[PDB]
C-alpha cells in the first residue's frame, strides 16, 4: 500500500533548463515523469539520472523495436539506469518481448515495469492498410495486447475506450497506461466526448500520461492536486 | 571519400569501446551506435566519436507518432550524425514528417533510412503481429513505402539487395548487415557490394579481430 501517483507528466522539452525549471515546480510524491525519444536523444541518461536524484519515478518511453538480442540489451540498459517503466513495440513480436522480460529477471522486485505498445494513437485504418495490416484496428490492438500478455509483459499502453475490455481478456493485474486524457479543470476538459481522468480510471486505466495541460500551467502543482483529488 | 564499411559498436562498457576505436582510422570506416550503447552512454558518446573524426550511423529505429518521431530525428540532426533510421512500419506520414524536419539542415543533414522487416522475423513471427504476406513481399511493400515518403534508402539483407535495387533504383541507398569477409552460405563484402549494397554493417569480424585496422584495409581493397 505504498504511494502510487497515477499521473505521468510528459516531458517534451528541447531545452534542459526549461525542463528542470518545470520539475522544480512539482513534487515527486504527486506524479511520475515520462522521458521520450526527443528528450532522451537530446539529453540522454544523465537527464534521467537527474530526475532520479530529485526523487521522481520515470517512464522511459523509447518504444524499443529491434531484433530480440538488441531490444533485450536496450531494456537491460534501462534497468541499469534504474527506471520505473520502459516500453517496447509489440509489433517487434513475441520472441523480442519475451527476451526483454527474461533479461530483467535479475533486477528483482525493483526492475522496470515492461510495457507493450500496440497500435500508435496516430494510426487509423488508412495508415494501417499502408503498412500491410488489413484487420480492423480494434481487433489488431487486441491481437497485439494479447501477444504482449502472452510474452509475460506487465501491461500495455491503451486508450480509455480499450481499457475495460483489455482487463476483461488479459487480467485485472495487467497494467494499463493511457494517454490523451485532459484535466477536468482545464479548458476543453469539460467536453463530454472524451473521458475525464475519473472516468478513465473507473474504466480501468492505471496511469494517465498527460502533457501540455500540466507543463503549460502557471501552477502545475495546483493542476496535479486537482487531478489527484478527483481520482 | 566514401567508406563503405560501418562498424557496429555494441559494447556495454565505455572504456572498452573507446579502446577499440583507438585502433582504427576514421578515414577507413564509419561507426554504428545502436540502442544499447545509446541507452547506456547517450549523445556524449556520439559526440566523442565525432571529435575523433568518425561519421556515425545512429541506429535507434525510431517508431512513434509523426510529431514525436520527427522531433527525435531532428535531435539526431542536432547531434550531427551522418545517418539515422526509422521503422517503415510507423507509416508514410511518420516517415515524411521526419524527412521534412531535416530539410533546413541542408546537404549535411543525416541520411534518413527506413527499417523494413527485422531479420528476426520469419513467417510465423509476422503472423503473430498481424502480417500474412510473405516476408519478401512485405519487405518490398515497406521499402516502396519508404521511397514514397522521400527517404534515402533502407536497411536490407544480402538476399534482398539486387531485387530492391532493380525495383527502386540506383540512388536509393541499401545498408546491409550480416556480411563476413572470407562458410559459402554468407556473402563476402565484395559479393554484397556487387549485389547492390551501398554500405555494409559489420560487427564481430572487425571488433573481435586481433588487428581490426588490417581487416578493414583488406575489406576496402577487395571492393576496388
Ligand atoms: Cl506537485
Ligand atoms: Cl536476435
Ligand atoms: Cl503526430
Ligand atoms: Cl497465417
Ligand atoms: Mg514543491
Kindly give the interhelix angle for B35-51 and B14-21, rounded to the nearest 10 degrees: 50
Chain B nearest-CA distance from A137, in A, is 11
Check: CB of residue B126 under 8 Å from CB of residue B119: no
User: Within an 8 Å CB–CB cutoff, is residue A74 touching chain B?
Assistant: yes
C-alpha cell at A218: 502557471
Residue partners of B104: CB distance under 8 A and separation at least 6: none
**Count of C-beta atoms within a 10 Å radius of residue B2:** 7
Q: Is A63 a catalytic residue?
A: yes
B88/A131 touch (CB, cutoff 8 Å), yes or no = yes
* Grid-cell match 527517404, residue found: B151
Q: What is the DSSP string of A103-172?
A: HHGGGGGGSPEEEEE-S-TT--HHHHHHTT--S-HHHHHHHHHHHHHHTT-SEEE--HHHHHHHHHHH-T
CA atoms within 13 A on the CB side of B96: 7
Per the CB < 8 Å rule, is B42 touching A46?
yes
What is the phi/psi pair of residue A54, to 5°?
Answer: -80, -5
- Cα A212 to chain centroid distance, Å, stands at 15
- Rounded Cα–Cα distance for residues B42 and B79 (Å): 11
Residues sharing a CB contact under 8 Å with residue A193, sequence separation 6 or more, in sequence order: none
Question: What SS3 class is residue B181?
Answer: coil
Nearest in space to B221 (alpha carbons), one of B173, B182, B178? B182
Q: CB–CB of B59/B81 below 8 Å?
A: no
Question: Residue A121: which region, alpha, beta or left (left: phi > 0; alpha: psi -120 to 50)?
Answer: alpha
Cα(A23)–Cα(B133) distance, rounded to whole angstroms?
Answer: 47
How many C-beta atoms lie closer than 10 Å to residue B181's C-beta? 17
Distance CA A63, CA A209 (A): 15
| Sequence-ordered list of residues with C-beta below 8 angstroms from that of A154, at least 6 positions apart, any chain | A113, A114, A115, A174, A175
Smallest CA–CA separation between A67 and chain B, in Å? 5
CA distance A51 to B49: 27
Contact yes or no for A130/A192 (Cβ under 8 A): no
Question: Which of A37, A41, A91 comes nearest B89 by C-beta?
Answer: A91
Instruction: Count structural domains, chain B.
Output: 1
Cell of A83: 527506471
CB pairs under 8 A between A and B: 138
> Could you tell me which of B33, B25, B28, B37 has the C-alpha nearest to residue B3?
B28
**A117, A162 contact by CB (below 8 A):** no
DSSP string spanning B154-179? Answer: EE--TTTHHHHHHHH-TTSEEEEE--
Question: Dihedral sign, CA of A96, A101, A105, A107?
Answer: positive
In whole angstroms, what is the distance from residue B110 CA to residue B112 CA?
Answer: 6
| H or E segment to which residue A210 belongs | strand A207-210
What would the grid cell of residue B190 be? Answer: 565484395
**Cα B66 to averaged position of ligand 3 atoms, centre (Å):** 4
Q: Using CA atoms, how far apart are residues B221 and B224, in angstroms rounded to an integer? A: 5
Gaps in chain A (C to N distance exceeding 2.5 A) after: none
Burial of B146 per CB tally in 10 Å (0-12, 13-18, 19+): buried
Residues in chain B within 8 Å Cβ distance of A141: none
Hey, what's the cell of A74?
Answer: 536496450
Q: Inform me whether the C-beta atom of residue B114 falls under 8 Å from chain A C-beta atoms.
A: no
Residues around the ion ligand 4 (C-beta < 5 A): B 127
- The method recorded for this entry reads X-ray
Hey, what's the cell of B104? 533546413
**Residue A213 sits in which domain range?**
1-231
Distance between CA A119 and CA A175 in Å, rounded? 16
Are A46 and B41 a contacting pair at CB < 8 A? no
Q: How far is A1 from chain B (nearest CA, A)?
A: 32
Q: Name the 3-class secondary structure at A72.
A: helix
Q: What DSSP designation does B139 have? A: H
* Helices A68-80 and A94-104, packing angle to 10 deg: 30
The annotation status of A69 as a binding-site residue, yes or no, is yes
Residue B110 to residues A44, B58, B77: CA-CA distances in angstroms?
19, 9, 6
Using only C-alpha atoms, chain B has a radius of gyration, in whole angstroms, of 17
**Resolution to 1 decimal place, in Å:** 1.8
CB of A66 within 8 Å of a chain B CB? The answer is: yes
A26 C-alpha vs ligand 5 centroid, how far in Å? 5
All cell numbers assigned to A28: 515527486
Region for A10 from its dihedrals, namely left if φ exceeds 0, alpha if ψ lies in -120 to 50, beta otherwise: beta
Contact between A130 and A140 (Cβ < 8 Å): no
A11 φ, ψ (degrees, to nearest 5)? -100, 105
What does the alpha-carbon distance between residue B171 and residue B26 come to, in Å, rounded to a whole number? 25
> What CATH number is attached to the domain comprising B150?
3.20.20.70
DSSP summary character for residue B108? G
Q: Is the CB of B131 less than 8 angstroms away from the CB of A133?
A: yes
A25 is an annotated ligand-binding site residue: no
Give the distance between the most distant pair of CA atoms in chain B.
47
Does any CB of chain A come closer than 8 Å to the CB of residue B5? no
Please give the Cα distance from B120 to A93 (Å, whole number): 9
**Strand B5-9 vs strand A155-157: parallel, antiparallel, or unpaired?**
unpaired
Length of chain A: 231
Grid cell 550503447 in the structure block, residue: B37
Mark yes or no for CB contact A93/B63 under 8 Å: no
Beta strands in chain B (DSSP E): 5-9, 30-34, 56-62, 83-87, 111-115, 153-155, 173-177, 199-202
Our measurement of the distance from residue A105's CA atom to the centroid of its chain's CA atoms, rounded to an integer in Å, reads 21
- Rounded CA separation B52/B22 (Å): 9
From residue A8, alpha-carbon distances to A112, B147, B193 in Å are 15, 37, 48
d(CA A130, CA A124): 10
Q: Who's near B170: CB < 8 A, 6+ residues apart?
A: none
CA nearest neighbour of B177 among B64, B76, B59: B59
Window 85-104 of A: residues touching B by CB (8 A cutoff) are: 89-96
Q: How many helices (H) and strands (E) does chain B have?
A: 10, 8
Question: Annotated binding residue at A215?
Answer: no
DSSP state of B106: G
Closest listed residue to residue B156, CA positions, set B109, B110, B113, B96: B113
Amino acid at each position: 500500500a505504498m504511494n502510487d501517483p497515477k499521473v505521468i507528466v510528459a516531458l517534451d522539452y528541447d531545452n534542459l533548463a526549461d525542463a528542470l525549471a518545470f520539475v522544480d515546480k512539482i513534487d515527486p510524491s504527486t506524479c511520475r515523469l515520462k522521458v521520450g525519444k526527443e528528450m532522451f536523444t537530446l539529453f540522454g541518461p544523465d537527464f534521467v539520472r537527474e530526475l532520479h536524484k530529485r526523487g521522481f519515478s520515470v517512464f522511459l518511453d523509447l518504444k524499443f523495436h529491434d531484433i530480440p538480442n538488441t531490444c533485450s540489451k536496450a531494456v537491460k540498459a534501462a534497468a541499469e539506469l534504474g527506471v520505473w517503466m520502459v516500453n517496447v513495440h509489440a509489433s517487434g513480436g513475441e520472441r523480442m518481448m519475451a527476451a526483454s522480460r527474461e533479461i530483467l529477471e535479475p533486477y528483482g522486485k525493483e526492475r522496470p515495469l515492461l510495457i507493450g505498445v500496440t497500435v500508435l494513437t496516430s494510426m487509423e485504418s488508412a495508415d494501417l492498410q499502408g503498412i500491410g495490416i488489413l484487420s480492423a484496428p480494434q481487433d489488431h490492438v487486441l491481437r497485439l495486447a494479447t501477444l504482449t500478455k502472452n510474452a509475460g509483459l506487465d501491461g500495455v499502453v491503451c486508450s480509455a475506450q480499450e481499457a475495460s475490455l483489455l482487463k476483461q481478456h488479459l487480467g485485472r493485474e495487467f497494467k494499463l497506461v493511457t494517454p490523451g486524457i485532459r484535466p477536468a479543470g482545464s479548458e476543453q476538459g469539460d467536453q463530454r466526448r472524451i473521458m475525464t481522468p475519473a472516468q478513465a480510471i473507473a474504466s480501468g486505466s492505471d496511469y494517465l500520461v498527460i502533457g501540455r495541460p500540466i507543463t503549460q500551467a502557471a501552477h502545475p502543482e495546483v493542476v496535479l492536486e486537482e487531478i489527484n483529488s478527483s481520482l
